[PDB]
């Protein structure tokens, strides 16, 4: 019954939260729909694959609330496998190389990609990380798609290509889908286009030894009984003097203060009393997840790296199921595997398939990419379809499709009267991981500190110490990367001489 | 406890289901979220208006279940006044002309024009109202806002500024949040742009003598104690041999079928055992709700009809609160009045004035648009901002943003085991009106005696004679409208 905060729900957001506030020596209630804590974050344990991530999974430098978290809890990172070469699969080729970016040729195509890049980053510069649709051209990028502005920028067929299957895969969702502000915000806030994209210093670093799901598994264990699994919340009542919080089992909570720690969307599960504000009451109809499937295809050996292959593959073309692939090996250099996302309209059409027929079109794919037969012969087989998780609505995150932003966008971290809401998608630095959902945790948890006079304003938002562990190598770019012009100012500069 | 079907939802897609099968014998209850049936209808009376519609309203011809329908409760219709002047008003500027569509006098101006509606009909006629996504160029259309098909039709601004006010009092969204394929269905579905337009002859022909919340009133007048108000749906159980439906004041149902009819979106707010298939899942959080506060001025007498002006204005502008309004006076003559939408980001935007302050900006309005002082007088003021309805999400209806309707549309009216869905949303002509929400209605409950063995598949969609108190003409094109140029073809031409 009574406490002091109840937390809805119970993944890396909600839990963060709630162990601050625990800290703190109130008394927290965490209230979750599942059988398990978690949300998108799950590590799943069975004796042909030991543990793996079927959820969120990555962690890298700048991402220092999560990893400082975790190390607390007493959890260990390692290396992603990037000693070999990425491969770029184009046009039913495979094309080896090193870095972080897939090499152009062309000298038109280079000055294309070289541009798109930098524009993104350019354009990212001008908006707020905390107010997106404070940036003086919001409007006309917020009511534009990603497709648009892609059109309007990308003068090859290649670019305009590369830069769809990046959209798709940091959102996963389409480009046509999807703002233009929107998404332009989502790589701004995680610091630029390289970092997002990177294995070595960017987001797909690391990993957890054991999983990520010990990050919520353990900060359960902390609390103890104060985590209430099968409890769906249904009803928020906030007329009365202290706030109560019914569940679907007919469990009735009482508190000072709630937290709401659920996807913008899944706020519709709920029925309030009074009514939310018009604004967050539309909002949260507007704001679906993406869509993905995450695939774990096991080897008896990474057959890849004896062909100088990382395990990195970046897939080109409507025919291929998954258009990103990374070395899923466990640091030991056993239990081998291969991780792919079938991303968007992908995971849509190819969920009518079985499992083994899903199986038999990566492990085929994969023989054509990496060239090897030794793809056709799996010994394992993993994968979660997160679009069909009532209690998730799809991953990574929320996206906002166009006109979205600039109308309700200032409404997502807007407390209504005694409900703060906290979540990955209220972040303003790598919203949509799991680093986003401590940040928000933890600044929800502070907000409410502030509110019972325990805490001066100032101190709701805090920075974080650079880890000591995953430190961050600067982004450079070169002189050449900065001044080459685009190929409408290589166009200009030929109109000009020509006079 | 006990029934045979459960309908959630009382407004009049709910309704007339639970009608239907009532009338065949079958034990129904309704399970209403709100203290009132209804929905997106509602009739608020009061000494000052008598009545007055504060959400769905219009009738008129081709709509022939809700005319029927509305017949068999003894309702009766009267005619909007269309007797004189429709008002354009552009630019600062009132331009008084007769018939559907404003008049365009410089020629270039009038080939944008006339190609643009054309050019939208002929879309239409490429998509299949049953089946949308079956388009020839669905994904093309569908991966396209509203707003970039305006950009590359309309060579002048003129017409893409009338296209754009079209796109917002049609479905009350902005051009850019909108799926050119979905906006193309939803057009040809009523009919077309002259029929989805027009007062005489389309869409806003008529009103109900009493108000349209009659229709779902008199339904739960003849469905008794049936009808469970203040029921908000919680949970659907389905893993049993009977289906459970749960509310959210602790009361348990047991049917052999339920019928969702309720906006697609708000079934979020039902939690689902087993777990709703995933494309349904995922549908559901990408379907919502347009904006729109509608707004009635009152006033002593129907000053405007002095003038000349029949009290439609068509009003261009970002400045204007109101882009649209018509006479909503009493067929008698009196409770004079004049009904205006703030339609889209201008209903977000104005949502935060007082009551007064909206009331002031709109009289300001009227009085510039219609060119009298007496519009500065107001006698009475009624409003409805229905973006703020927990229980409806917004109106008039769903909008697909884009990608959307080819990646989920086929899912939209598939029966989730023993759950069948009815709403305005799954209807194939007039979705969004009144008249879809009968006709999905009824299709659902005939979907539900078709599993019950009671009638043959053949039965399922029944057509609907024409109604011989509203009858419909055609629509007809000129030879003019129908060959003349293009502005690009114009220029191929030179
Ligand atoms: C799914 C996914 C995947 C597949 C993958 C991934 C991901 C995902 N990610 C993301 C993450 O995971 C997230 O963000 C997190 O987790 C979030 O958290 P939060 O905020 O907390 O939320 P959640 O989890 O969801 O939780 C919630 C909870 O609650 C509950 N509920 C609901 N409802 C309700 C409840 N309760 C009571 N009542 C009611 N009503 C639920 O149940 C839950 O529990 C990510 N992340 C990171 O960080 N990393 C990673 O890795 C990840 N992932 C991916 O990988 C990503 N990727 C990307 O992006 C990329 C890649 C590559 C390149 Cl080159 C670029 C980019
Ligand atoms: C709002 C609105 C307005 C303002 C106006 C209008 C409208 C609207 N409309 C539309 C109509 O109204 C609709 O469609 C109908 O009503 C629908 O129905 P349904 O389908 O049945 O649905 P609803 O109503 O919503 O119902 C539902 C129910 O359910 C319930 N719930 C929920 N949730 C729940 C429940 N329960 C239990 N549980 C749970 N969970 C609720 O509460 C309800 O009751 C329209 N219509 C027609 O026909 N007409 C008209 O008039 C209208 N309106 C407008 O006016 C339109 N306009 C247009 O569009 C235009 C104008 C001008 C021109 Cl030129 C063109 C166009």
């Not at 009803?235 to 909570?253: A, F, K, S």
């Not at 640091?331 to 027929?357: C, D, S, V």
């Not at 920075?463 to 070169?478: G, L, M």
């Amino acid at each position: 019954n009574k406490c002091d905060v109840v937390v809805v729900g119970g993944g890396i957001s909600g839990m963060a939260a709630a162990k601050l506030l625990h800290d703190s020596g109130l008394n927290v209630v965490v209230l979750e729909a599942r059988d398990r804590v978690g949300g998108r974050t799950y590590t799943l344990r069975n004796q042909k694959v030991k543990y793996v991530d079927l959820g969120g999974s990555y962690v890298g430098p700048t991402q220092n609330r999560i990893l400082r978290l975790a190390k607390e809890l007493g959890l260990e990172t390692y290396k992603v496998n990037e000693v070999e070469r990425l491969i770029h699969h184009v046009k039913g080729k495979s094309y080896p190389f090193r870095g972080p970016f897939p090499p152009v040729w062309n000298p038109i195509t280079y000055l294309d990609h070289n541009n798109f890049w930098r524009t993104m980053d350019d354009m990212g510069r001008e908006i707020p990380s905390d107010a997106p649709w404070k940036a003086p051209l919001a409007e006309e990028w917020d009511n534009m798609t990603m497709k648009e502005l892609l059109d309007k920028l990308c003068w090859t067929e290649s670019a305009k290509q590369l830069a769809t299957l990046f959209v798709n895969l940091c959102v996963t969702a389409e480009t046509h889908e999807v703002s233009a502000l929107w998404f332009l915000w989502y790589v701004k806030q995680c610091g630029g286009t390289t970092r997002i994209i990177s294995t070595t210093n960017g987001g797909q670093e690391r990993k957890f030894v054991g999983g990520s799901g010990q990050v919520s598994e353990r900060i359960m264990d902390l609390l103890g009984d104060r985590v209430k699994l099968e409890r769906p919340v249904i009803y928020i009542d906030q007329t009365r003097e202290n706030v109560l919080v019914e569940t679907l089992n007919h469990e009735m909570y009482e508190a000072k203060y709630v937290i709401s720690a659920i996807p913008p969307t899944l706020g519709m599960k709920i029925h309030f009393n009074p009514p939310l504000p018009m604004m967050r009451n539309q909002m949260i109809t507007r704001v679906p997840l993406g869509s993905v499937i995450k695939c774990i295809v096991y080897y008896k050996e990474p057959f890849w790296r004896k062909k100088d292959y990382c395990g990195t593959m970046i897939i080109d073309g409507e025919e291929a199921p998954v258009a990103y692939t990374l070395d899923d090996t466990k640091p030991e250099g056993n239990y081998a595997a291969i991780m792919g996302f079938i991303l968007a309209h992908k995971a849509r059409k190819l969920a009518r398939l079985t499992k083994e027929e899903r199986l038999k079109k990566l492990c085929e794919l994969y023989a054509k990419v990496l060239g090897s037969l030794e793809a056709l012969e799996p010994v394992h087989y993993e994968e979660k379809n997160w679009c069909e998780e009532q209690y998730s609505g799809g991953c990574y995150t929320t996206y906002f499709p166009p006109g979205i932003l600039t109308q309700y966008g200032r409404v997502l971290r807007q407390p209504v009267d005694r409900i703060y809401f906290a979540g990955t998608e209220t972040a303003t630095h790598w919203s949509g991981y799991m680093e986003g959902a401590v940040e928000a945790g933890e600044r929800a948890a502070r907000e409410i500190l502030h509110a019972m006079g325990k805490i001066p304003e100032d101190e709701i938002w805090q920075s974080e110490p650079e880890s000591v562990d995953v430190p961050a190598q600067p982004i450079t770019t070169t002189f050449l990367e900065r001044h080459l012009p685009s190929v409408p100012g290589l166009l200009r500069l030929i109109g000009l001489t020509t006079i």
